[PDB]
């Protein structure tokens, strides 16, 4: 059934599961033509497939070439997502195949379901959570690899860097969703907070700065304040 606040901790048990977010699969700039009409230009996108327990991210890069000569692209994008997720599953050894896949947008349930007909013991699940996974392209290294890609390419990352050496999945995921949520609500400030201190670097094999534990607490506080502020501004509360 649908994932929500109630069954939140199931994400961190030992049932392999993956989130699939398709928000950045079909990405366009909207521009005017010489005649003054509007036209879109596709840019590279990605499927964001993430094992919330382990931090393993399967960043399937969606090259603009996949759209060439295709109609109804925002609809196709959901089927292409589902096709690529299915191929990822098929590519994994059996014991690595997920028991659940939780799509972050309900529009993905049927495409994925139909693509997973060969895997009837894999539950395709919606979620009531407003996960901020769309802000994945606010992570510099992820945005860079997508933008530079010249072909379809799968790129593997651990979205938790090394956090799990010191914290739990649950905390790791909460740290991640807070960073991304702040990146989503005010990217510029969120990134400012992350690099304001030139002395805290991002390791070449990491996505996020190498904060000590105390510095993560301060960071998390700064992201929480950021998110709260933006809310008042949005609503005049």
């Amino acid at each position: 059934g649908a994932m929500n606040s109630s069954n939140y901790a199931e994400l961190f048990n030992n049932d392999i599961k993956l989130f699939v977010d398709d928000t950045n699969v079909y990405r366009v700039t909207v521009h005017k033509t010489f005649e003054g009409n509007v036209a879109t230009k596709a840019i590279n996108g990605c499927i964001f497939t993430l094992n919330p327990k382990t931090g393993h991210l399967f960043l399937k890069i969606i090259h603009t070439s996949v759209w060439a000569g295709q109609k109804r692209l925002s609809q196709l994008a959901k089927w292409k997502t589902a096709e690529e997720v299915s191929a990822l599953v098929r590519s994994l050894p059996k014991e690595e195949q997920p028991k659940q896949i939780i799509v972050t947008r309900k529009a993905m349930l049927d495409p994925l379901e139909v693509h997973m007909l060969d895997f009837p013991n894999i539950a395709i699940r919606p979620t009531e959570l407003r996960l901020p996974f769309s802000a994945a392209m606010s992570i510099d290294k992820l945005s860079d690899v997508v933008m530079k890609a010249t072909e379809p390419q799968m790129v593997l990352f651990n979205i938790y860097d090394d956090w799990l050496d010191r914290i739990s999945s649950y905390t790791a995921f909460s740290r991640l969703t807070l960073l991304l949520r702040a990146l989503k609500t005010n990217e510029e400030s969120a990134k400012m907070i992350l690099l304001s201190d030139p002395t805290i670097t991002i390791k070449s094999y990491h996505l996020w700065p190498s904060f000590t534990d105390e510095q993560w607490i301060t960071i998390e506080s700064q992201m929480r304040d950021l998110i709260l502020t933006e809310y008042g501004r949005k609503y005049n509360v």
């Binding site: 589902a82 049927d110 007909l117 060969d118």
Partner: protein, 300 residues
Amino acid sequence: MNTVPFTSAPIEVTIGIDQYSFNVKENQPFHGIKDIPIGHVHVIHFQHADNSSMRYGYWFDCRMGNFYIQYDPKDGLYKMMEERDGAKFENIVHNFKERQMMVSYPKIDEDDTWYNLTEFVQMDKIRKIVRKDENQFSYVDSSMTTVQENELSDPAHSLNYTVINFKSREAIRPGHEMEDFLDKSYYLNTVMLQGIFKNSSNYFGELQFAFLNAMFFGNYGSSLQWHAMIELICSSATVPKHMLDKLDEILYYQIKTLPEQYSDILLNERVWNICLYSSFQKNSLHNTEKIMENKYPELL
């Protein structure tokens, strides 16, 4: 013109035959229905005055034998039986007609409703959906479940309709996931029409039989099956033009015949709004669309 005699009417029951029905009082001297038009299937059906639950009845064809109704006081219902002794049966029948204890199948001569509802329904096919091969007629009731419904429990009493499932391997070719699910032409024409039903007439027959089971017995699984077979046609971009025109006629007479007060449970909002307004064949159901709008514009 054929007869179905009744041994007695021991319990107060509303009897129907096809789209007609009569109130019959406890031990009222009622002894059959006469002038039943040869050439179509028929259904005689019952709803006891005391148990407005469980509508039940018998599908039959008078060419396939001589049938009569007898109340069973053990099992508590009007049972259809077959009389093998042709003479003993013409005897019973002629004696009841003479005593005029029989209702006349009340067909208006201008009226093609029953033909139109049963155009494609064959008793040989009914008897495959309702498996009971020691009887030439077929028992159906309100509560019988379908083969699909059971999968998701007694198989002897099941409605073996053709399973239709839009998210199945049957329905979706590997490699045409998106195509075949958005455009069921493959599943309809190759899997179902060419593959399972053999032709459109067997398909329309099952569709029509499913509608009638829903209408006369409120069999919920028949309703599901009727809606599935419509949706599969309406969701196919490529349908023979003859099936499209016939379908509009079929559905017209079905919508025309439904009791008005039942449109809420018999008619599935999503399927109809999709078929009439969103599907490939939105514009191919002119008669069905016109009556639906002028008669149930709420659902839409």
